[PDB]
């Protein structure tokens, strides 16, 4: 529904979609070879399967040939800075694939909005048209060098060259935090065994310890205990409370 979606949004208004309460098969995403670039920063591409993530956001837009390398943390560019900025500590995978089959039929649909947003904080959308604002003292017309329309659009023709050839890109934004994990991978789980030296991974915490019943009473909302040294010591069993 978001990755193999019928329609992709423009860079002008890139759609942000909530994903929750769903077990996620990352294997079909990794094994499938339709994906051109699959370079990952916060997570291993191969090990994207086992781990659990609290919240996954999927970002959708369509880019040229240059942006596949341009859309990365710490890289500077026209669209990279003026349109959609990737946080320097972004934890996730950038995913891109071919778009000749679906797009570039003349297909004039896409728009990218250049000079207007000189500075944008990360993950921010600018839906204001703002026709002028390039900079000069006069206004109310474009005039010359004084101002110009930021909202330029892509022209995709059935004759588009490989260099300007369009590509579809989907960026899944993983926010790594401690909270109830909506998405996890397709692994069934064993029951509980106590008072035994067992390698344990609870809600994806991981570690080695001895599982024992705790007399300490959580407040109902709390999920993970911790120590003076800020290491995990108390956990709430996910399936049964």
């Amino acid at each position: 529904e978001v990755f193999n979606a019928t329609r992709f949004a423009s860079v002008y208004a890139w759609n942000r979609k909530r994903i929750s309460n769903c077990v996620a098969d990352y294997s079909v995403l990794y094994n499938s070879a339709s994906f051109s670039t699959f370079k990952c920063y916060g997570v291993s591409p191969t090990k994207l399967n086992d781990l659990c993530f609290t919240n996954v956001y999927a970002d959708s837009f369509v880019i040229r040939g240059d942006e596949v390398r341009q859309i990365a943390p710490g890289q500077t560019g026209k669209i990279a800075d003026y349109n959609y900025k990737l946080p320097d500590d972004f934890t996730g995978c950038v995913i891109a694939w071919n778009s000749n089959n679906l797009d570039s039929k003349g297909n004039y649909n896409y728009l990218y909005r250049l000079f207007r947003k000189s500075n944008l904080k990360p993950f921010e959308r600018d839906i204001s048209t703002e026709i002028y604002q390039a900079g000069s003292t006069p206004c109310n017309g474009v005039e010359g060098f004084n101002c110009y329309f930021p909202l330029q659009s892509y022209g995709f023709q059935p004759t588009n060259g490989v260099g300007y050839q369009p590509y579809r890109v989907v960026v899944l934004s993983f926010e790594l935090l401690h909270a109830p994990a909506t998405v996890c991978g397709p692994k069934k789980s064993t029951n509980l065994v106590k008072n035994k030296c067992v390698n344990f991974n609870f809600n994806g915490l991981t570690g080695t310890g001895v599982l024992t019943e705790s007399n300490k009473k959580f407040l109902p909302f709390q999920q993970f205990g911790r120590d003076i040294a800020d290491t995990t010591d108390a956990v709430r069993d996910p399936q049964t409370l």
Partner: antibody
Amino acid sequence: QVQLVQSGAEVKKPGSSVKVSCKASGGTFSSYAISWVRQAPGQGLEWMGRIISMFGIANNAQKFQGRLTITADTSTSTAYMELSSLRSEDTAVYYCARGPYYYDSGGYYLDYWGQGT
Amino acid sequence: IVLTQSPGTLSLSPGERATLSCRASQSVGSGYLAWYQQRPGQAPRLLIYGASSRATGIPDRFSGSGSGTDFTLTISRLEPEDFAVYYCQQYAGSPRTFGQGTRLEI
């Protein structure tokens, strides 16, 4: 190829409101800055409005500011104009204008006009 | 701004080199003018845009020049079917203003 249909000639009573159409047939619509112009009989042409089709937002010429509401219906690929406070002298021929609003491609103003009302 | 043309009408026999210049009261730009040719009782048609960037679909015979506050449109070889009305049209910013028109008579 591209054309805007001519209407039947109009005469209007003072104080009413007149709606004038502008059809677009053929070519690649929704990428043009369709606008609105007019010329009184025996006087030069004067501009009234400018429409960017994608965001459907329009601006009105100073001299006509506060009297014209202009909208563009992308679904039917048409451009509409609404004029209020009609007077006796306002009966005249009314034109329609367009042209791509794209910069760094030169352009900004082009022709692609029709015939009139 | 008012775009003052030169002159209101130039009475030229066919074949004459007609410079229908147009002068601006303040600077506008060198890729900032456009000229439209209105056929009798019809709607004007673009021939030259951005002062000198020739519009596609138009013969080379028509050629605009100038920059700043003084702009020039030249018609090199008048033919009998070219009698028509020509309008200059400021292209930079502000409300669009169209020239007063030149009528070519016999």
